[PDB]
A paper describes a structure:
Thus, U6 recruitment into spliceosomes proceeds though a novel, and poorly understood, RNA remodeling mechanism involving large-scale conformational changes. There are protein–protein contacts in the U6 [name] that were not visible in previous structures, including a 660 Å2 contact between RRM4 of [name] and [name], and a contact between the conserved C-terminus (or “SNFFL box”) of [name] and [name] and [name]. The architecture of the free U6 [name] provides insights into how spliceosomal RNAs can be remodeled in the absence of an ATP-dependent helicase.
Inside the ring, RNA is bound in a shifted register relative to that observed previously. Instead of being bound in the Sm-like pocket of [name], the terminal nucleotide occupies a new pocket comprised of residues in [name], [name] and [name], and the penultimate nucleotide is bound in the previously identified Sm-like pocket of [name].
Numbering used by the authors:
A (entry chain A): 26 to 398, 432 to 445
B (entry chain D): 2 to 46, 65 to 84
C (entry chain F): 10 to 86
D (entry chain G): 26 to 71, 82 to 105
E (entry chain C): -1 to 79
F (entry chain B): -2 to 95
G (entry chain E): 1 to 87
H (entry chain H): 2 to 44, 47 to 69, 75 to 108
Write the structure that this text describes.
Amino acid sequence: TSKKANEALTRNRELTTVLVKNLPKSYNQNKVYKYFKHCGPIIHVDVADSLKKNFRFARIEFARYDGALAAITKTHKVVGQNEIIVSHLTECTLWMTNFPPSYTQRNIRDLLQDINVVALSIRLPSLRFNTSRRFAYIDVTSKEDARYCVEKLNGLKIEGYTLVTKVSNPLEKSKRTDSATLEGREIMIRNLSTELLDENLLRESFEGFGSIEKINIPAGQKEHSFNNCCAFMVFENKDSAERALQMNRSLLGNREISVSLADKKPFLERNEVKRLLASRNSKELETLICLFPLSDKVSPSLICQFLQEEIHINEKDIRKILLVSDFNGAIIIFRDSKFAAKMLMILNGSQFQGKVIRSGTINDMKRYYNNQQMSNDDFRKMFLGEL
Amino acid sequence: LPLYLLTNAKGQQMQIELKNGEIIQGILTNVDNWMNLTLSNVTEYKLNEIYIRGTFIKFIKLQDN
Amino acid sequence: SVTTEFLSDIIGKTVNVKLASGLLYSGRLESIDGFMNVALSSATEHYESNNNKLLNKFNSDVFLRGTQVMYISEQKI
Amino acid sequence: AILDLAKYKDSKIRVKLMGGKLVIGVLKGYDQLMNLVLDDTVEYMSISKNARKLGLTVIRGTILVSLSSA
Amino acid sequence: GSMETPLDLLKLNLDERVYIKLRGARTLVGTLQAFDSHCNIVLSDAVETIYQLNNEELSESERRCEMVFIRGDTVTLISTP
Amino acid sequence: MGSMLFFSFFKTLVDQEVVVELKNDIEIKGTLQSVDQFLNLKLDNISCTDEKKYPHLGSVRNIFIRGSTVRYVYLNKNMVDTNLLQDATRREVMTERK
Amino acid sequence: MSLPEILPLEVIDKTINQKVLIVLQSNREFEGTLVGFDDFVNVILEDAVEWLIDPEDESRNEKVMQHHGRMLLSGNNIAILVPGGKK
Amino acid sequence: SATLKDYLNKRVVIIKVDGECLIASLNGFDKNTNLFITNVFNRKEFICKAQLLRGSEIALVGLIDALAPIDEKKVPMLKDTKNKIENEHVIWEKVYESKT
RNA sequence: AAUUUGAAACAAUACAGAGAUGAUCAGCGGUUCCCCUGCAUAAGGAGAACCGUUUUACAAAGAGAUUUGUUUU
């Protein structure tokens, strides 16, 4: 069995993380560092304002437990003229999901602010391996604040999205709505004819392999009279789907179909990006630009949103936005090469998330990344002398 | 493709007109990726070798071969 | 380094800037960069020497291309 | 890269240079960028009457256009 | 404090009429719309002036144009008219 | 590395009629078809302007031009947003030296 | 036995604070005290003499200017460095 | 993208910076426009077949259609890319006194 | 080891931290290299980069080979 030493790694997190309460208004992140760096090597420091802005909180993630203990010995010391308190940060962490795709850290801080909850730390995930990732861990200042956030924020509708707010505990994680695809139970059937795009016929043709949970036929295939149609079929267990792959290269009706396990989206996007990065054509590449350098936490919705709110680009001018974290950048694919060229001109040197970014072609993005990674006689005499 | 042709051209007779309108007549013995040369048995317009800085080349007349 | 310290302690002094073409510019060095681009206020233009016939007197800042610059020197005369 | 100056490391060479200058002298040393140290240097401008003596010199590798034996 | 580079100071002249002296005894005057670190320039409402020597008398001719790109390598100096 | 500005500028003028005047005094009317990182120009359906005094071509409809031989590129005011050029320029000089 | 080598940039280093003559590609030279240089052999000279040089007769040389203070002489056109200066 | 692909193995007119035209066939090229060309002749006795032209010296490549039509010889003779006039300073002092 | 089209990637986006990943950004075989545990040597530790090899549904069409100090006079 694989065991839950998740409780191990979470205990490590709390155990080596401290909360410092009641630092002076004038105390910044740097001064927190100087005050505590004698306690032990520090991994991270967060500072947050109090509710009435009269003092500050700090979160310090220490490398090792002895450092957290040393930090806690500072409880009831006096800083400036403020008496601080140092304690382990515990049962003060939320996991939040399904905020709107365009919410930023500031939006989340302000969300908690609206109900008079100070947020000490908001931690967003890397989009390296899945561009769609969207959740957050939030450390607040008390166990009560955590319970209040769950009571008030779980189920709240924000921009049409039903928010999820939970007291953080990874063991309680929900089963995803796409888990069937993630689990390898969903097959994709390709190269069906229009005559064959029929749920009943597919059930008779595939149900021998195992119980079918679901059949999805993408819309628009009959209406646009496609030569080739696709369908997706989810089986209740992995063994059934695997055995159903034997229908590959087999005859169905009067057509020859392909059948394979459905790939997941992050995989498909990376293969699209891999295809793009190796390209030597030019009609497609000349319609896209790159922005760099960017945090691997920046989602396409934020980049699209940035183009709309800061650059005033029309939604339908953007064909696609793809992340390229191996070069710390992002690709924006537009509708014509002239518009792309003009966006290239407008965007280079602009500010995003408070930092100046540059635009350019793919090779430009790669290059930037790689680059960041006395008497004549006297003189004659010494030499002559050696000879 | 051109520097490739010079690489294989190793051992050919050649005439090199430089920016200074001087001529060199010799037998290519080495080029590099920057187009510098060394050539065997040479006429300036007497020498056995010569090194020619590629930036100072106007063009090279090769053999019809 | 010796060069960057030179650029630091010649800001504001009067200089002569000679181009490769032999044109000579005199005036107060308002700005200089690493590429030897120059901005000069009150620039006179002579050929080769300040003692020759005056070609131009300039009334605003003149910018000069570093790629064309042969030398820059302090004027003490 | 292509020419090992060591074979030329102590004889008189003929060096043509970019601005028209011709220089002859004994090769004392060199680097990868083809900067050279020459002794007994003579500088010719563009025959024999156009001759200046310079003694010990360094020719900048950046303006070298051709090198040969002398 | 800090360091205005000559390029930065020249960008202070953006949208204004400038005087450019070019290689080959030629000068332009126009309204500076753009330039880069190579001194490539886009001038609007420009006026080129070509100066020549007939034996011992100075003669000139002029061209005028709406919008003109200028390759930096021909530029010897920039100032104001 | 930098530049970019005029490269992007020219990418906006592809399919516009321009006149390229060269260091050799030759003037060429043509349709911009492509540009590269060195600002080499490929012009389609060319004709020598000023005068066909420079007949040396005649039987030439599309030319490649080495960026380093260009002296002037004449354009029309209709073709350019002078706001984008001034804004982009202030951002770019800022970029090349920082 | 094998007596050591001379490296050009090392010679130029050994010329700092001595007199030097810097000859350009054209018929022009600057004599002065070498203050320092950079990677590209841009040179800082102090109280430099600027000469135009007659090819036939070294006496009919022309002193273009006596410089005072320091000059930065761009290493673009620099053909030859002579430590100790002329003769 | 602007490559010299379309011009491969087709007849071409080359203008070199010296101000010399060339009729040729462009067999090869690199990303420095170093021209590998064959069956070159002026504009008009055949000089040769097979030469390397160095990109630095190329001003202009033009794509031609048929080799005849055309020939010429009473033309002011085209210049070079350099504009080394002569006594530019003389011209500038003339302009100074002209503005006085 | 390539591109374009048939060709529709569905299923409400989100649904558990660099605590993420399918060569998706990998495993394995090798080469070289940046420091430590240390006098040495020698376990082993933190690994980086290049080169072999292990993965890819079907069809058709046309065919990308450009390959990682010459362009700021």
